[PDB]
């Protein structure tokens, strides 16, 4: 209904006049089925009461997925929901209950479903949101369906779990069969793990990446993709609309959020659930239209790098990377070395009892894998060690004033003490050294001890070793991180380019290693979104490309 060129302009008009357009629109979505008198009598039947997570969240009779009768057994709180150019593309359903685990897996068998999108954690902020309907390891039995965990792939924002499910009351087929045994199928669960328990995601990028990967995983001649959260309406509907519109844009170069959303609200109630979720659909789709696509396979990286350097797509990416903080901003400016490099509000590292100049930064495997901070000032050394302590951080990378204790005198922080236990050194290629100091932080009013290793690195990157030697130091930190818990603290002077570059290059090399793909823009954009002024010159950004290129061999 809206050509994709009109969208920058379209969202501007929805945002304008105190966002009156968004408000009107979402109110229209809220009232657009009232007059249709859509019934949900099976949902409301007393016998199905225990099979509903919430009393208010129902499955409309006309679009509800029905289970085959067994000798009210037909009922599940799930509805078919259209996609783009496809009827019944999704089953949208609640987070299953222990009492409905069987029904859930039975419905996945009966509908020929191969993909589950789970957009919730099990427990969020002390509240049970979803029961665990899959085996932690090995196998578990849900009536006639045996569900086996085959593999788990963990990323920062989502986890992929490959399952084989076996229906014991279904025939095995012919032995020669290339498709395998016909009473077994693969189900892949794409589980988003970083959705806030309050409101909508701060960053559309990792959500867009999740939507795109989970969606492209739909195989032909397959049943509906199952999408659930807790209620199976808000995050679920959000997903379905960004997915469907992602596919509409690709095909027609139009976008139709309101009309499509009003349609699917005939299919399940309280799709999508909040005005803030409505706005996030728009934000994220706009972000999709404008950010192009930047993930590039290993065997395309050389050619891609070539064409982004010719007038330039590198320059246009970097303006988006450098587009990028209230507390910093502050009665805290004498805690900052340079207040052009400070944390955002969302990524700010809080001290338990407020401010330290430090930012959470994402890694490949975990959000909050790193903390990028500044070299501690003498009046910021107690705060620095309080951060280590509060976050149970066991690794400090210093990239060049001693803020650490000597053997003679321990450091007293009220809650704990810092004590050196040994000093040492690792060697590198050009006779370069990393100085190591090992500290223990012992609680003063408890018995906990935290082992913290400190790396003083040479000048890095070394401009007169091959660019591929940049990863030697990265690989040393990776290998230490394997044996330790908590975040990795990385600081240079301000928490700027050298700190960011260790984080970016670590992330991107874990990506190339694990996916044979690299997304330099996303990694660089997220670092700058979480801490403004890490990457400021285009040559630093180009060096991320050049460096990653040297590993493609």
Numbering used by the authors: 827 to 897, 903 to 1142, 1148 to 1160, 1168 to 1196, 1204 to 1250, 1260 to 1412
Anything the authors wrote about it?
Protein tyrosine phosphatases (PTPs) play a critical role in regulating cellular functions by selectively dephosphorylating their substrates. The ∼280 residue PTP catalytic domain consists of an α/β structure, and biochemical and structural studies have led to a detailed understanding of the catalytic mechanism (Barford et al., 1994; Zhang, 2002). Key features of the domain include the PTP signature motif, the mobile Trp-Pro-Asp “WPD” loop that in the closed conformation positions the conserved and catalytically important aspartate residue, and the phosphotyrosine recognition loop. Here we report the crystal structures of 22 PTP domains, including two tandem-domain RPTP structures and a detailed structural comparison of this protein family.
We also report here structures of two tandem-domain RPTPs, RPTPɛ and RPTPγ, revealing the domain organization for the PTP subgroups R4 and R5. In contrast RPTPγ showed significant and concentration-dependent dimerization. Sedimentation equilibrium confirmed that RPTPγ formed a stable dimer in solution. The experimental data fit well to a self-association model resulting in determination of a dissociation constant (KD) of 3.5 ± 0.3 μM. Analysis of the RPTPγ tandem-domain structure revealed that RPTPγ associated with a symmetry-related molecule as a “head-to-toe” dimer (i.e., with the D1 domain of one molecule interacting with the D2 domain of a second molecule and vice versa). The interaction between RPTPγ monomers involves extensive electrostatic interactions from the active site D1 domain of one RPTPγ molecule, visible as a highly electropositive pocket, interacting with an electronegative surface of the D2 from the other molecule. The dimer interface covers 1200 Å2 (∼5% of the total molecule surface area) and involves residues from the phosphotyrosine recognition loop, the P loop at the bottom of the active site cleft, and sheet β6, while the D2 domain interface involves the loop connecting strands β10–β11. In this dimeric form, the active site of RPTPγ is occluded by the D2 domain of the interacting molecule, suggesting that dimerization in this conformation would prevent substrate access leading to suppression of enzymatic activity. In RPTPγ mutant “RKEE” residues, Arg958 and Lys960 of the D1 domain were mutated to glutamic acid, and in mutant “DDKK” residues, Asp1305 and Asp1306 of the D2 domain were mutated to lysine. Both the RKEE and DDKK mutants were entirely monomeric in solution, as assessed by velocity and equilibrium AUC analysis validating the head-to-toe dimerization model. In the case of RPTPγ, which had the highest enzymatic activity in our panel, the observed head-to-toe dimerization might provide such an inactivating mechanism.
